[PDB]
Amino acid sequence: DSGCVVSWKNKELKCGSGIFITDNVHTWTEQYKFQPESPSKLASAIQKAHEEGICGIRSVTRLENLMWKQITPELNHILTENEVKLTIMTGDIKGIMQAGKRSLRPQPTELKYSWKAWGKAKMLSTELHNHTFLIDGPETAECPNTNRAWNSLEVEDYGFGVFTTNIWLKLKERQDVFCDSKLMSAAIKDNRAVHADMGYWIESALNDTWKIEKASFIEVKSCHWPKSHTLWSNGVLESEMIIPKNFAGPVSQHNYRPGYHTQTAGPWHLGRLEMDFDFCEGTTVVVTEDCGNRGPSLRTTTASGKLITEWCCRSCTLPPLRYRGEDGCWYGMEIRPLKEK
Amino acid sequence: DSGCVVSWKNKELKCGSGIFITDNVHTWTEQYKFQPESPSKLASAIQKAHEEGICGIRSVTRLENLMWKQITPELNHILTENEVKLTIMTGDIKGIMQAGKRSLRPQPTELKYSWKAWGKAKMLSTELHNHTFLIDGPETAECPNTNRAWNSLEVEDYGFGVFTTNIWLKLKERQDVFCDSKLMSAAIKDNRAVHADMGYWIESALNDTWKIEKASFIEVKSCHWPKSHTLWSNGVLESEMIIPKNFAGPVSQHNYRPGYHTQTAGPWHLGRLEMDFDFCEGTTVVVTEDCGNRGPSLRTTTASGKLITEWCCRSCTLPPLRYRGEDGCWYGMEIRPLKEK
Numbered sequence: 001d002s003g004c005v006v007s008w009k010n011k012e013l014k015c016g017s018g019i020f021i022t023d024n025v026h027t028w029t030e031q032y033k034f035q036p037e038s039p040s041k042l043a044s045a046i047q048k049a050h051e052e053g054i055c056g057i058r059s060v061t062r063l064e065n066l067m068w069k070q071i072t073p074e075l076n077h078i079l080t081e082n083e084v085k086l087t088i089m090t091g092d093i094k095g096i097m098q099a100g101k102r103s104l105r106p107q108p109t110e111l112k113y114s115w116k117a118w119g120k121a122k123m124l125s126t127e128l129h130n131h132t133f134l135i136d137g138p139e140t141a142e143c144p145n146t147n148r149a150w151n152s153l154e155v156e157d158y159g160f161g162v163f164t165t166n167i168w169l170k171l172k173e174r175q176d177v178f179c180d181s182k183l184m185s186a187a188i189k190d191n192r193a194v195h196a197d198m199g200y201w202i203e204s205a206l207n208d209t210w211k212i213e214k215a216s217f218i219e220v221k222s223c224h225w226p227k228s229h230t231l232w233s234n235g236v237l238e239s240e241m242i243i244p245k246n247f248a249g250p251v252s253q254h255n256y257r258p259g260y261h262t263q264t265a266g267p268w269h270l271g272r273l274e275m276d277f278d279f280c281e282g283t284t285v286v287v288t289e290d291c292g293n294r295g296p297s298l299r300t301t302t303a304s305g306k307l308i309t310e311w312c313c314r315s316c317t318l319p320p321l322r323y324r325g326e327d328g329c330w331y332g333m334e335i336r337p338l339k340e341k
Numbered sequence: 342d343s344g345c346v347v348s349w350k351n352k353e354l355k356c357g358s359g360i361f362i363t364d365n366v367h368t369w370t371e372q373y374k375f376q377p378e379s380p381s382k383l384a385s386a387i388q389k390a391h392e393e394g395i396c397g398i399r400s401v402t403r404l405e406n407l408m409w410k411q412i413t414p415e416l417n418h419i420l421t422e423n424e425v426k427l428t429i430m431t432g433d434i435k436g437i438m439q440a441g442k443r444s445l446r447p448q449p450t451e452l453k454y455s456w457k458a459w460g461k462a463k464m465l466s467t468e469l470h471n472h473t474f475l476i477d478g479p480e481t482a483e484c485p486n487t488n489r490a491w492n493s494l495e496v497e498d499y500g501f502g503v504f505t506t507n508i509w510l511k512l513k514e515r516q517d518v519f520c521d522s523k524l525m526s527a528a529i530k531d532n533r534a535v536h537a538d539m540g541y542w543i544e545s546a547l548n549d550t551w552k553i554e555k556a557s558f559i560e561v562k563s564c565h566w567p568k569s570h571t572l573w574s575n576g577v578l579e580s581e582m583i584i585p586k587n588f589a590g591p592v593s594q595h596n597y598r599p600g601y602h603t604q605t606a607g608p609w610h611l612g613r614l615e616m617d618f619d620f621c622e623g624t625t626v627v628v629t630e631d632c633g634n635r636g637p638s639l640r641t642t643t644a645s646g647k648l649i650t651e652w653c654c655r656s657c658t659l660p661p662l663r664y665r666g667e668d669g670c671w672y673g674m675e676i677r678p679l680k681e682k
Contacts, residue, residue: 001346001347001348001349002346002347002349002364003344003345003346003347004344005342005343005344005346005361005363006342006343006344007342008342008343010499010501012501012502012503014361014363016363016364016365017363017364018361018362018363018364018526018528018535018537019362019528019529019530019533019535020346020355020359020360020361020362020530021359021360021361021362021528021530022355022357022358022359022530023343023357023358023359024357158351160351160353161353162353181531182531183531184529184531185359185528185529185530185531186528186529186572187359187360187362187526187527187528187529188360188525188526188527188528188569188570189360189361189362189525189526190522190523190524190525190526192360194359194360196359210569227573227575228551228572228573228594229529229572229573230572230573231527231569231570231571231572231574232568232569232570232571232574233573233574233575234568234574234575253569254569
C-alpha cells in the first residue's frame with residue numbers, strides 16, 4: 001500500500017508504502033455498509049429457526065441494524081411466497097445495543113422454491129400474520145434476549161467497494177462471542193496507539209507512561225474485542241481497564257490509566273460518547289480523601305437544569321474523566337459532588 | 342495523518358486519515374540516520390567511564406554503528422584537547438551484532454573545558470596513545486563483551502527531518518535490555534500484520550489461521566523486542582516462536598507457524614536474510630518420519646559448490662522454510678538431507 005501522507009502536528013511530509021490504518025470513524029457515517037448474499041438463504045434460515053423458538057434478532061452492529069431495514073420487505077415477500085405464516089417486524093435502536101443468547105445456523109440447504117438472480121422487481125407488500133418475528137427494538141418485555149439471535153453474520157468476498165463501500169455477508173457457520181475480525185484496525189507509531197472499527201476509536205498516547213488519552217463511540221456493542229487485534233495484551237487486570245470487556249473493550253495494557261478503575265456503570269446508556277480528559281465548563285474538581293466512594297456516573301447538570309459548582313474525587317488523577325453526548329456533560333465513576341447528597 | 346493510498350493487490354483506491362505505517366525498510370538504506378547532541382557530553386561520558394574498566398562499545402543498531410564512524414575523529418580531537426590520554430579506534434561490523442554487558446551512564450556534569458556551539462572547524466588529527474578505546478569490530482579476543490558498553494542511546498527531540506532524516510540522540514539515563522521504542526511500528530488491517538523498525542519487516546498473514554508469511558532482516562540486533570509494540574501477546578510459548586527472542590523476535594502469537602519450532606541455530610551469522618516459504622531452485626522436500634532430528638541449518642550447496650538433490654523433514658509443513666543471502670540459499674532448522682550423512 002504505497003502513497004504519501006502529510007503530517008499535521010509535525011508540520012512535515014512523508015512518503016512510502018506498507019500498512020495504512022484509516023479513518024471513517026468520524027465526520028460522517030460513510031461505509032453504509034452491509035448487504036447480504038442471495039436473500040433466499042437468510043429467508044430459509046429464519047423460517048427454519050422459527051420452529052425451535054427463535055423469537056427475535058438483536059443487532060450486533062448498528063450498521064447491520066440499518067441493514068435489516070432494507071431487506072424486511074423482501075424477506076416478508078419471499079416468506080409469503082413460500083406459503084409459511086411468518087411476518088417480520090423491525091424497529092429502531094437505542095443504546096446500549098443488547099446481546100442475545102442464541103444464533104442463526106445452517107441448514108445450508110435453502111428453500112429451493114425461491115428465485116436465483118437479483119433482477120426480481122415490482123414487488124408487492126404483505127399483511128399481518130398470527131406468528132410474527134420481531135427485530136431489534138424496544139420490546140424487551142414480550143420476549144427476552146434469551147430467545148433471540150445474535151452475532152450470526154460475517155463479512156466475505158473481501159467486502160469493499162465500489163462504489164460507496166460494499167460488504168457481501170454470509171451467515172456464520174459456528175457460534176461465537178467475539179466481534180467480526182475481518183474489519184478491525186490496530187496500530188502504533190512511536191507516540192500513539194489506536195484501536196479502530198466501525199464505531200470505536202480508542203486511542204492512547206505516551207507522556208511518561210502509556211495510557212489512554214481519548215476515545216469516541218458512535219455505538220456500544222456487546223461483543224468481546226478479539227485478543228488477536230490488541231497491542232500489549234499480557235498481564236492485564238480486569239479491575240483496571242477503563243472500557244469494560246463486556247462493552248467491546250480491548251483486553252490490553254493500553255486501555256489502562258493510572259489512578260482509575262473499570263467504568264462498569266458509566267453513562268453508557270447514551271448512543272454517542274466522547275472520552276476526553278478535561279473539565280466540563282463551569283465545574284472544577286479537587287482531590288480529597290474525605291470525598292465519598294465511587295458510584296454511578298452523574299450528569300453535571302441536575303434534572304431541573306442547574307449546573308454543579310464543585311466536585312471531589314477519592315483517588316483520581318488530574319485531569320478528570322468526563323463524557324459528552326446529546327444531553328450534555330457527564331463525569332467519571334470515581335467522582336462525586338463535593339457536598340451535595 | 343490524512344492522505345490517499347492506492348491499493349496494488351486489490352486494484353482499488355482509498356482516502357482518509359489516521360495512522361500510517363511506513364516503508365524505508367527496503368529499496369535503499371535511507372534514514373541514515375543517527376547524529377548525537379553536543380559531542381562534549383559523550384566525550385565526558387566516555388572519559389569518565391574509561392576509569393572503571395569500560396574497554397569497548399558494541400553497537401545496538403548498524404545505523405548507530407555507522408554513526409560512530411562520523412564522530413570518532415571529533416571525539417579523539419576533543420579528548421586530546423582535554424589532556425586525557427585516551428584514543429578511540431573504530432572498526433567494521435559483521436553479524437551477528439553481539440550484545441555487551443555494561444553501559445554508559447551520567448555524570449550529566451560534562452567536561453566544561455570544551456566548546457558550546459557547532460561551528461568549530463579546521464580540526465587537526467591526533468596520534469596513537471598507550472590507552473586505547475575500541476569500538477564494535479572483530480576484536481572479540483582482546484577484550485570480552487562483558488567489559489563493553491551496550492544500549493546507551495535513545496532518540497529525543499522527536500528525531501526526524503528535514504532533510505534526509507535526522508534523530509538527535511541523548512544517552513540513556515538508565516540501563517535497559519529492550520530496544521528503543523521511539524522508532525517502532527506494528528499494525529494490522531484485516532489480512533496482514535507487520536512489525537517494523539530500522540531493519541525488521543516481520544509480516545504475517547491469514548489463510549486459515551494467523552501465521553508468519555515473510556520477513557526481511559538487514560541486521561540482526563540482540564535487543565529484546567518490547568512487549569508494548571507486539572500484537573496478540575498472550576500465552577506465547579518460547580519453543581514455538583520462529584524468530585528467537587534473543588535476536589529481537591516479537592513476543593507474539595503472530596510469530597508462530599504450525600509444524601515449526603524456534604530457529605535458535607539458523608543461518609543468523611549472515612547479515613541479510615530473506616524469510617520466504619518456497620524451495621531453493623533445483624531442490625525438493627518430502628515429508629518423512631524416517632528423516633533425522635532437527636539440527637543446525639545447512640546450505641543447499643556444499644563447500645565445493647554442488648547442489649543437493651533431495652531433502653527430508655520430520656514434522657515440517659509444506660512449503661518449507663528457506664533463507665536467502667549473499668552466499669546463496671539455506672534451509673530451516675527442521676530439514677535434513679534425505680540420505681547424505
